[PDB]
C-alpha cells in the first residue's frame, strides 16, 4: 500500500547514492511487503531488481576492482533473492519468467569463475523452457554445454551436446528449420571433437555416438569444406597420423569458433601427449 | 589525372572524425556508394567501407547511429557473402587477423539487433525497420534454394526480368487457410532472424532491449505474416505466444503504451496463425488444440480489461470479465492512460498520428477483432453485452476500429466467422531451365441477440453523414453491406431512407471533383448499392 | 580485386549453356576439346549442374575425350588442391572410360594420393584400387598397353620411396598382383640401435614410449645421445617430465640431468644465431633497418630453424615449470639467464613473424611460445634480467608481440580491443600494457561474454603474462595511473632509468569514486613490486581516510593490500603467488606405517590424476597437468609438497581453489609461530600496519560520543576488514582489542540489521577462539550464534557456522558450553535433511561448510555428539554420493568423498560407522563421469587398505572392468596402479589367470596398457626369487596365447609377452618399443618376434623336457609363411 512505495523510494534513492548494498536490501523489504499483500508481479519485480543490484555489487567487487578479499558474499544473497522470485514465478504459472531469471543467475555465476554452478542453473532453465519453448531450451542448453567445457567436464558437455542434437532433430525437422540448423551444426562439430578427445571404447560407445562416428567414415547441414576437414580429422586420429592432425588443426582454425578451436587443440595435445601416465 | 579510388581514403578518414556532424555526413556518403562499389570492380573498397562504418554503433550522436542502421539496410548480403568467400587478405585487416570477417553476423547481431536495446526510442524504431529490410537479403550456407552466394545473387536478377508475363465470409487480417507456397530460403532467413530476436527477449536485463525486441518482432509479423510464413516462426504454429504473454502479465511492461500495444498485435498474430490446424470442424469449443485454450483465454480476458480502462478514461469515471479494480497492476495502467488522454484533451494536434492513447485503443480493438474470428456464439454469447457497452465509450475516440469490432461480433453472433465455418537448384535451373519450362508450359495451355447492436449501429449511420473521414465512411458501408448480406431488412436500418439520399447526393460532389478522397469510397458505395438492388 | 558477381553469373552460366549445346551435338568434336583443355577447372567446379553432368558423362563415353580430361587435370592439378575442389575432381574421375585406366591410375598416385586430407587420400586409394581391378580383369595385352613396364615399375618405386606403400596396403598388393600376371644375441650394443631407430626420427607418434627408451640407456652415453644432432628434439620435454617423476620420488634422475643440460645447450646455441644487436619487433613496418630485418627473415623464414623454436620452447617450459621445486644444483645457472631471456623474446618474435607472413601458427607452437614467456617472467633470476635497463628493447619486444598475438586472435577487423624525448616504442609499450590490463576485465576474463573470441587455452596464459609485464619498471608507474586521471588535468614530467617513472596519483584525484575504483583495480591486479611501492600505496590509501563510498572503498582497498602480504612464494606478486593456507587438519598417523606408506604410494598416483581433471588451476597458469601445489609453508618456511598434504586441505575448500576463505588459517598455526596460549613477510613491516588498523578501527566504530555515529554502510565493512586482517595478527593483545572492538558494537548497533551480523559473528568467534574461549567470553558469544542461526539472511547463518568451526577447532570448549553442540548438531541435521538429495537447488556454500564441520566434529570430538549424529552423517553424506550429476555437483560430491576418506583413515571413527561407510565404496565406482569414478577409486583403495579372498575378489574385478569400459585416460591410470594392487592383497597364484586372461580378450580395448601390467607383475616375481613361477604360467597360457583372432594381435602379444617373461636386462628394456608398434606386421616386427622368443626358449627354461610342450603348442598353428613358422625354423637349429 504505502510502506512498499516508501521502501521503493528508499531503494532508488540509495541507488542514486550508490549505496546499493542497502538499496537491494530495501528492495527486499518491499518484496516482503508485497508478500503481505500477495502482489505476484510486484513481488517478482522487487525480488528480481534486488538480485540485479546484488549481482552488480558482486560484479563490482570481482570485475571492476577484483578485490582479493572478496569471497562471493554478495552472490549468496543474490541467489536467495533470485531463487525466491523463481519459486514465486513458478507457483503462479509463468515458467518462462522463472527460467529467464535462472538464466540471469547462471550468467552471473559463469562470469564470476563458477562454470559448474552456472551449468546447473543453465540446465535448470532449459528444463523449465522445454515444454513450451524448445528453441529457448536449446539456447539454454548450449550455454550449459559451454559452461561444462569451462569446468573441464568433457563427458558432461558431451551428454548435453547429444541431448541438444536429439531435441533439435525432434522439434525442428528431413531438413532442419534454419534456427535449429545452427544448433545441429554446433552439436555435430562439438560432439565429434569431444568424441575424438575422449575416445570412448565400444562398451561405452552409445548408438547415438556410434551412428555419428560412422557418418565420418551425407554432409547433412554441415558445410562441405568443414565436413571434409572433420572427416579427415577422424581418420587421422584413428590412424594416429600426427602430421595430418597438425595440418588440419591450422586449416580448420578459421572455420571453428574459439570454443571449438580449444577442443581441437585438446585433441591434438592428447594425441601427442596422452594424459594419465603421470608424466 | 584524378582517380576514382581517391575518395575511398577520404571517406574512411572522415568516418573517424572528431565531429559528429561530419561523421553523420560521412555515413550518408558511404550509403550512396557502398552498394555500387560492392557491385563493381572496386568491390574490395566497398567491403572495406562496410567494415569501417561498423564502429559508428558506439557513437553518442543518435543521428549517427540511425544513419548507420539505414546504411546497412541498403547492403545486399548475398553479394557481400560472395565477396567475403573470395577475399583472402581482407579477412586479416590491418593487424593480421586469424579468422573471418563475418560481416553479416556482426551487422545482424552486433549492430542491427544490438541497437534494439538503445536508450533512444528513435534508434530502436530505425533498427527494427532495418531488420525487416535485411531479411530477404541475408545469405546462409547449406540452403536448399541456394547452395552458393552466386546462385543466390543470380536468383534475384532472374526473378524480375525473367518473370513470365501472365495473369491469374471475409476472414480477418492475420488468418491464412489455404496452403501458401513459401520460399524455402526465405523461411530459413526469417527463422534465423526470429530466433536471434527471441533469444534477446528472455536474456534481457534492460527495459529498452525488451521494448525494442517486442517492437521488432511485431513488425516482422506484419511484413512477414505468421500465418503465411508458419515455418519461419518455429514449428501452422504459434511460435512465441507464451514468450510474449508473460510480458503482458507483468508489472512494468504494460505501463509502456508503445511496447504494450506492440505485444498485443504480436500476441494476436501468433495465435491466429495456428487457426486452420487448431480448429475442430466447454470453453472455446472451436479450438481443437486444447494447449492453446489458456493462451487464447488469457489474451481475450486481458483485452477486455484494457478496453474497459480506455472506456473508463474516456468517460473519466474512477475505477465481470473486463473488471480491473481488483488488480493493482491494471490500476497502474489506468493512471498511465488517464495522464496520456489528459494531455490529448488540452491540445489541438488533429493531424497527429503518433499519439499513444489513440494508438493503444486502436491496437486493442484491432487484436480483439482478430481474436473474435476463433470464437463461437457459445463462448462469447454470455459476454457480448459489456463489449458492446465498452465500444460505445470508445466509439467517439476511434469510430473506425469500433465499427470493425462490431462487424466481427456480428460474424460470431451469426456464425459467419472462421470458427463457425471449417471443414540442387543452381544457375541452370534459375537462369534458363525453370523460366523456360514455365513459359513453354503456358504456351501449351494456350491451345486449350441482434437488437443490442442497434444502439451502436445508428451511431455509425449518424456519424457517416457528419464526418470527412473516408476510412470511417467506407467502413460504415462495409458494415451496412454485411447487415444486408445477413438478411437484416434494410427497412429496419434506414427508416426514412435518409441515409441512401445522403449517399446519392454525395455523387454530385464526387463527379465534379469536389470530394477529396472519393476514390477510396467509390468501390464500397457501388457494392453497397448493387447489394441493395435485391432488398425490397 | 574481388571482381564483379554479375560477371561471374554470366561466366558460369555461359559455360553451363555451352556444355548443354555440346551434349546435343556430339558429331562435332572441335568444341568438346576446347572446353576440356580451357575450362576443366570450371567443368569440375560446375560438375553439379545437370548440363555439365551430362557433358562429363559424354566425355567418359569417349576414349579420346577422356584422355584429354586426364591430361588437362594434370596441367591444372595445383589449383585443384582445395578439399572441396579435389572432392569434385575425384567424382568426375571415377566414371572415366576404361581405355584410359592407365592414365588416370598414374594421376592418382603421382599427384592426388599424398594429401593431408585423409578422407580424400582414402578416396583416391579406393578409386585407384578399382582401376587396377578392371585392369587385371580385362584383356592382358590391352592392360599392358595402358601400363608400360617402366610406368609399372616407376609407380611401385614411388610407393615404396614414400610411405604410401604401408599406408595403402590394398593398392600396393593389387599393384603387385597385376605385375606377376604380366611376368645374434641382444646385448647392450643391440639395445642402443633400437632406440636409435626410434628416437632419431621426426616422429611424434610415440613420445612417452620414446622417452622411456632413452631412459634405459647407460647414463654415461645419455649426454652424447641427446646432444647429437638428428636426435628428436620433441623428446626433450617428455624426457624432462619422465625424469621429473624419478626426482619427485627422491631418486636421482640421470635422464633429467642429461635432458636439462641438452635443453640449455640447444637454447644457448639457438641464441648465438640471433643478430648481435636487438631491436624492438615492429609488426607494422619491419623495414627501417636493412640487415636486421633481413637477418630475421632468413632465420624465422627457415622451415628447419622455425620448427625448432616451439619444440625447444616446449622443453624449456617443461624445465622452468619444475625448477622451483628442484634441488640446489639443478637450478637455473646464472650464466644462462641472459640467453634464456633472449630465447624467449626470439620465440615470441618468431611466432609473430609466422603470423605476419603465414597463417596462425600451430596451437601447440603458439602455446609453447607463451608457456616460456609466462614461466620465465615468474623466475626472479630471469625477471631481473628482462627488467634491467640493458634489456629495455627485449621487454618492449615482449609487450609488442603479446599485444600483437592477442589482437590477431581476439580482435576482428573494424573492432577495438577495448569496447567503449624518448624513443617512440617506450611510450607505445606503456600504452599497450595499459590497454591489455584493462582487457583483463572483459576480453581476457575466462567465461566472460567478451572472452568468446579467445580459445580457453590462451586466456590463462595471457592473463599471467600481462600481469608480469605490467610489473616491469618500464611500465609499472604508468600502468598504475587510472585512465580517467590521464584525461583529466594531470601531466607530470616522467624521469628515471627509462624516462617513464611517473609519480603516484595525488590524493585529490582519488576523491572521485570512478577513478578510485580504477586505482583500486590496478593495485589489486598487479600487486606491489617492492616494499617501497607497498609503503607508497599504503600511505596513499591512508590519505584517502581523512561521500562515504570513498570511505568504504578505501577500507576495502586497505584490506586487500594487507591481505596481499600473506601470499607465500612472493608476497606482492599475484602472477606467481596465492594466499597462504594453514590447514586445520593435522597430518594423518594412519599413513607412514607399514601399510600406510604403501597406501600413500597408490593413493598419491590416484590423487595426482584427480587433481589433473577436477581442480580449477587457479595457481597454475600453463597447461602442464601435474603441477598442482598448495600454499602451505612449513611453520616449524618453504612450501610443503602436495604429496605430503594428502587429506589435510580444508574440506570446505574446493579442489584447486585458492581464493580467500573464512577458515584460511587455523588457530593452531596462530599458536605455533607466534607463541600464543589460548612477522616481516618478504621484508614488509605488517606489525605496524596491522596495529594501525586495530587502533584506527577501534576509534572508527566504538565511540558513540562525538558527533555522528558513522553510517551503516561503513560499519559492516570495518568488521569484515577486521575479520580478514586478523589472519596476520601476531600477539594475543591484538586479539584482545578485536574482541573488545566488537563487544560494545554488538550492543550499540540495533539488531534489525542482517548484512552487519554476517561479518560480526565469525570475527568474534574467531577472536574468542584465539583468545581462549574461556568462561567470561564463552557466554556472550555463545548466545551470538543462536540469535544469528534464525536469520532470514542465509549468509549470516553459514558465516555463523564458520564461526562455530573456529570456536570448536582446538580450544577445548568448557563443559558449561556443552549446550552449543546440540543446538548446532541438530541444526546440522535439520537443515541438511531437506537438501541431502537436492543440494543443487540450494546454496552450495552452506552445504560445503555444513559437511566440513560435521567431519571435524566427528573426528575430533566424537563424544560431544551422540552416535545418532555420527551414524546418520555417513548415511546422510552417502545419499548425496549415490546420486546423479544433476542432483549432486562435483564439488559437493568430492568434498564428501574426501572427508569420508580422511574419516575412515582416522581411527576415531566407531566400528559400526566404519564398516557402514565401506559398503558405499562399491556403488560409486561405475559412474559415467571419469572423475567421479576416479575419486571413488581412491575411496575404495583407502577403505580396503585400512581394513587390512571373499571381498577382495569383488573389488579387483571392478579394477579390470574399468579398464575394459573406460576412457584411455581412465584405463591408463588404473593399469598404472594395478601391479602394486595385485602384488599386495592377492597371492601370486590367486590372481594370475585374470592378469593374463584380461590381456587376451576381444573385449579388451587396451592391450597396450595391460602389457605393462603383465611386465611389472612378471618382473615383481622374477626379482623376488619366484623365477620358476613365471615360467609355469607361460606354458599354461601359450595354448590360449596362440589362438588370438587377429594374426597381427597374436604375434604382437607374443613379442610383448616374451619381454615380460625375460631375464636379460636388455630384452626387458625394449617393452615401450614393442608396445609402440601395436598392430604392425612389418619385417622388423617379425625378426623382433624371433629374437625375444629365443631369449626365453634358449636362455632360461624350467627343464629340457618342458621345451617339447613349448614346441608342441606352437606347432598347432604353424602356418606355411606366418611368423610362427619362421619362429619354429630358427629354434630348430
Ligand atoms: C586452459 C586450462 C583451464 C583451466 C581452468 N579452467 C579452464 C581451462 N586447461 C588446463 C588443462 C588442459 N588440459 C586438459 O584438460 N586435459 C584433459 C583432456 C582429456 C584428458 C585431460 C584430463 C585428464 C588428465 C589426466 C588424467 C585423466 C584425465 C586444458 C586447459
Coordinates of C-alpha atoms in Angstrom, one line a residue, chain C residues 405-673:
Chain C
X405 CA 49.2 -12.0 -30.8
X406 CA 46.2 -11.2 -28.7
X407 CA 44.7 -8.8 -31.2
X408 CA 45.4 -11.2 -34.1
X409 CA 43.3 -13.8 -32.2
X410 CA 40.5 -11.9 -30.4
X411 CA 40.1 -8.6 -32.3
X412 CA 38.2 -8.7 -35.6
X413 CA 38.9 -6.1 -38.3
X414 CA 37.0 -3.0 -37.7
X415 CA 36.9 -3.7 -34.0
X416 CA 39.0 -2.5 -31.0
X417 CA 40.4 -4.5 -28.1
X418 CA 38.5 -2.3 -25.6
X419 CA 34.9 -1.7 -26.5
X420 CA 33.5 1.6 -25.1
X421 CA 62.5 12.9 -25.8
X422 CA 62.4 9.1 -25.5
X423 CA 62.1 6.5 -28.3
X424 CA 58.6 6.1 -29.6
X425 CA 58.4 2.4 -28.7
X426 CA 58.9 3.3 -25.0
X427 CA 55.6 5.1 -24.7
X428 CA 53.8 2.8 -27.1
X429 CA 54.7 -0.2 -24.9
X430 CA 53.4 1.8 -21.9
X431 CA 50.0 2.3 -23.7
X432 CA 49.9 -1.3 -24.9
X433 CA 50.3 -2.7 -21.4
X434 CA 47.7 -0.3 -20.0
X435 CA 45.3 -1.4 -22.8
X436 CA 46.0 -5.1 -22.0
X437 CA 45.5 -4.6 -18.3
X438 CA 42.0 -3.2 -19.0
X439 CA 41.4 -6.2 -21.2
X440 CA 41.7 -8.5 -18.1
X441 CA 38.2 -7.4 -17.1
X442 CA 36.2 -8.2 -20.3
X443 CA 38.4 -9.7 -23.2
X444 CA 40.6 -11.9 -21.1
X445 CA 38.2 -12.8 -18.3
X446 CA 37.5 -16.5 -18.5
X447 CA 33.9 -17.2 -19.1
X448 CA 33.0 -13.6 -19.9
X449 CA 30.9 -12.6 -22.9
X450 CA 33.8 -10.7 -24.5
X451 CA 36.1 -13.8 -24.0
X452 CA 34.1 -15.8 -26.6
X453 CA 36.7 -14.8 -29.2
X454 CA 39.6 -16.2 -27.3
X455 CA 40.2 -20.0 -27.0
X456 CA 40.2 -21.3 -23.4
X457 CA 43.8 -22.5 -23.7
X458 CA 45.1 -18.9 -24.2
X459 CA 43.2 -16.9 -21.6
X460 CA 45.1 -18.2 -18.5
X461 CA 48.4 -17.7 -20.3
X462 CA 47.9 -14.2 -21.5
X463 CA 46.5 -13.1 -18.1
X464 CA 49.7 -14.2 -16.3
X465 CA 52.0 -12.7 -18.9
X466 CA 50.2 -9.3 -18.9
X467 CA 50.4 -9.0 -15.1
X468 CA 54.0 -9.9 -15.1
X469 CA 54.7 -7.5 -18.0
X470 CA 52.7 -4.7 -16.2
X471 CA 55.1 -5.2 -13.2
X472 CA 58.1 -4.2 -15.2
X473 CA 59.7 -0.9 -14.0
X474 CA 59.5 0.3 -17.6
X475 CA 55.6 0.5 -17.5
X476 CA 54.7 -0.1 -13.8
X477 CA 54.3 3.5 -12.8
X478 CA 52.3 4.4 -16.0
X479 CA 50.1 1.4 -15.7
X480 CA 49.0 2.1 -12.1
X481 CA 47.7 5.5 -13.2
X482 CA 43.9 5.2 -13.9
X483 CA 42.9 6.2 -17.4
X484 CA 40.4 8.7 -16.0
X485 CA 43.2 10.6 -14.4
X486 CA 45.0 10.8 -17.8
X487 CA 42.0 12.5 -19.5
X488 CA 41.9 15.0 -16.6
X489 CA 44.4 17.8 -16.0
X490 CA 47.3 15.6 -14.9
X491 CA 50.5 15.6 -16.8
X492 CA 53.8 15.4 -14.8
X493 CA 57.3 15.1 -16.1
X494 CA 58.4 11.5 -16.0
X495 CA 62.1 10.7 -15.3
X496 CA 64.2 7.7 -14.4
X497 CA 66.1 4.8 -15.9
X498 CA 63.7 4.7 -18.9
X499 CA 62.0 8.1 -18.6
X500 CA 58.7 6.6 -17.5
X501 CA 59.0 6.8 -13.7
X502 CA 55.7 8.6 -13.1
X503 CA 54.9 9.7 -9.5
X504 CA 51.9 8.3 -7.5
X505 CA 48.5 9.8 -8.0
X506 CA 47.7 12.9 -5.9
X507 CA 45.1 12.2 -3.3
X508 CA 42.8 14.9 -4.7
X509 CA 42.2 12.8 -7.8
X510 CA 41.1 9.7 -5.7
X511 CA 38.3 11.7 -4.2
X512 CA 36.2 10.9 -7.3
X513 CA 34.8 7.4 -7.0
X514 CA 35.2 6.4 -10.6
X515 CA 38.9 6.9 -10.6
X516 CA 39.4 5.5 -7.1
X517 CA 37.7 2.3 -8.3
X518 CA 40.1 2.2 -11.3
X519 CA 43.1 2.8 -8.9
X520 CA 42.0 0.0 -6.6
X521 CA 41.7 -2.3 -9.6
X522 CA 45.2 -1.7 -10.8
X523 CA 46.9 -2.1 -7.4
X524 CA 45.0 -5.3 -6.7
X525 CA 45.6 -6.8 -10.1
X526 CA 49.3 -6.1 -10.3
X527 CA 50.3 -6.1 -6.6
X528 CA 53.4 -4.2 -5.4
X529 CA 56.8 -4.8 -6.9
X530 CA 58.8 -3.8 -3.8
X531 CA 58.4 -2.7 -0.1
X532 CA 58.9 0.9 -1.1
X533 CA 56.0 0.6 -3.6
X534 CA 53.9 -1.2 -0.8
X535 CA 54.6 1.8 1.5
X536 CA 53.7 4.2 -1.2
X537 CA 50.2 2.8 -1.8
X538 CA 49.7 2.2 2.0
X539 CA 50.3 5.9 2.6
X540 CA 48.2 6.8 -0.5
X541 CA 45.2 4.7 0.8
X542 CA 45.7 6.2 4.3
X543 CA 45.5 9.7 2.8
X544 CA 42.0 8.8 1.5
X545 CA 40.9 8.1 5.1
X546 CA 40.6 11.7 6.4
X547 CA 30.8 10.8 0.4
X548 CA 31.4 7.7 2.5
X549 CA 31.5 5.4 -0.6
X550 CA 35.1 6.6 -0.8
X551 CA 35.4 5.7 2.9
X552 CA 34.0 2.3 2.3
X553 CA 36.2 1.7 -0.8
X554 CA 39.4 2.8 1.0
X555 CA 38.7 0.4 3.9
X556 CA 38.2 -2.5 1.4
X557 CA 41.3 -1.5 -0.6
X558 CA 43.4 -1.4 2.6
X559 CA 42.1 -4.9 3.4
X560 CA 43.3 -6.3 0.1
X561 CA 46.6 -4.6 0.3
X562 CA 47.4 -6.0 3.8
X563 CA 45.9 -9.4 2.7
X564 CA 48.2 -9.4 -0.3
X565 CA 51.2 -9.7 2.0
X566 CA 50.3 -13.2 3.0
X567 CA 50.9 -14.8 -0.4
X568 CA 53.7 -17.4 0.2
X569 CA 56.2 -17.6 -2.6
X570 CA 56.4 -13.9 -3.5
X571 CA 54.3 -11.6 -1.3
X572 CA 53.5 -8.9 -3.7
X573 CA 53.3 -10.9 -6.9
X574 CA 49.8 -12.0 -8.0
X575 CA 51.2 -13.7 -11.1
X576 CA 53.3 -16.1 -9.0
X577 CA 51.7 -16.4 -5.6
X578 CA 48.4 -17.2 -4.0
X579 CA 47.0 -16.6 -0.5
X580 CA 48.7 -18.6 2.3
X581 CA 46.8 -21.7 3.6
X582 CA 47.2 -23.2 7.0
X583 CA 45.0 -26.4 7.1
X584 CA 43.2 -27.1 10.4
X585 CA 43.7 -30.9 9.9
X586 CA 46.9 -32.4 11.3
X587 CA 48.8 -35.0 9.2
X588 CA 47.3 -38.5 9.4
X589 CA 49.1 -41.1 11.6
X590 CA 47.2 -43.8 9.7
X591 CA 49.7 -43.2 6.9
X592 CA 53.6 -43.5 7.3
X593 CA 53.1 -47.0 8.7
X594 CA 54.0 -50.4 7.1
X595 CA 50.7 -50.3 5.2
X596 CA 50.0 -46.6 5.2
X597 CA 53.2 -45.9 3.3
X598 CA 52.1 -48.2 0.5
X599 CA 48.7 -46.7 0.6
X600 CA 50.2 -43.2 0.1
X601 CA 52.1 -44.5 -3.0
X602 CA 48.9 -45.9 -4.6
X603 CA 46.7 -43.1 -3.4
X604 CA 49.2 -40.4 -4.5
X605 CA 49.1 -41.7 -8.0
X606 CA 45.3 -41.5 -7.9
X607 CA 45.4 -38.1 -6.2
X608 CA 47.6 -36.7 -8.9
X609 CA 45.2 -37.9 -11.6
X610 CA 42.2 -36.5 -9.7
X611 CA 43.9 -33.1 -9.5
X612 CA 44.6 -33.1 -13.2
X613 CA 40.9 -33.3 -14.2
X614 CA 38.8 -32.0 -11.2
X615 CA 40.7 -28.9 -10.0
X616 CA 40.4 -25.4 -11.3
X617 CA 44.1 -24.5 -11.7
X618 CA 43.9 -21.1 -10.1
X619 CA 47.6 -21.1 -9.0
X620 CA 48.7 -22.7 -12.3
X621 CA 48.9 -20.6 -15.5
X622 CA 50.4 -23.1 -18.0
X623 CA 48.9 -26.2 -19.4
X624 CA 51.1 -28.7 -17.6
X625 CA 48.8 -31.2 -15.9
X626 CA 50.9 -32.5 -13.0
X627 CA 51.9 -29.1 -11.4
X628 CA 49.4 -28.8 -8.6
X629 CA 50.8 -27.3 -5.4
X630 CA 49.3 -25.9 -2.2
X631 CA 50.3 -22.7 -0.4
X632 CA 51.2 -24.5 2.8
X633 CA 54.6 -23.3 4.2
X634 CA 56.4 -25.2 6.9
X635 CA 55.9 -23.1 10.0
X636 CA 58.4 -25.2 12.0
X637 CA 59.4 -21.6 5.6
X638 CA 59.4 -23.4 2.3
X639 CA 56.2 -24.7 0.7
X640 CA 55.1 -28.3 1.6
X641 CA 55.0 -30.7 -1.3
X642 CA 51.5 -31.6 -2.5
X643 CA 52.2 -35.3 -1.9
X644 CA 52.6 -34.5 1.9
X645 CA 49.2 -32.9 2.1
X646 CA 47.1 -35.9 1.1
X647 CA 43.9 -35.1 3.0
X648 CA 45.0 -32.1 5.1
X649 CA 43.4 -29.3 3.0
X650 CA 40.2 -27.9 4.3
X651 CA 37.2 -30.0 3.0
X652 CA 35.1 -26.9 2.5
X653 CA 37.7 -25.6 0.0
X654 CA 37.0 -26.8 -3.5
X655 CA 39.8 -28.8 -5.2
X656 CA 42.3 -26.3 -6.6
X657 CA 40.5 -23.1 -5.4
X658 CA 43.0 -20.7 -3.9
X659 CA 40.7 -17.7 -3.3
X660 CA 40.3 -16.3 0.3
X661 CA 38.2 -18.4 2.7
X662 CA 36.8 -17.6 6.1
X663 CA 38.9 -20.5 7.6
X664 CA 42.0 -19.7 5.7
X665 CA 44.5 -20.3 8.5
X666 CA 43.9 -22.5 11.6
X667 CA 44.2 -21.2 15.2
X668 CA 46.9 -24.0 15.5
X669 CA 49.0 -22.0 13.0
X670 CA 48.4 -18.8 15.1
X671 CA 49.8 -20.5 18.2
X672 CA 52.7 -22.2 16.5
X673 CA 54.8 -19.4 15.0

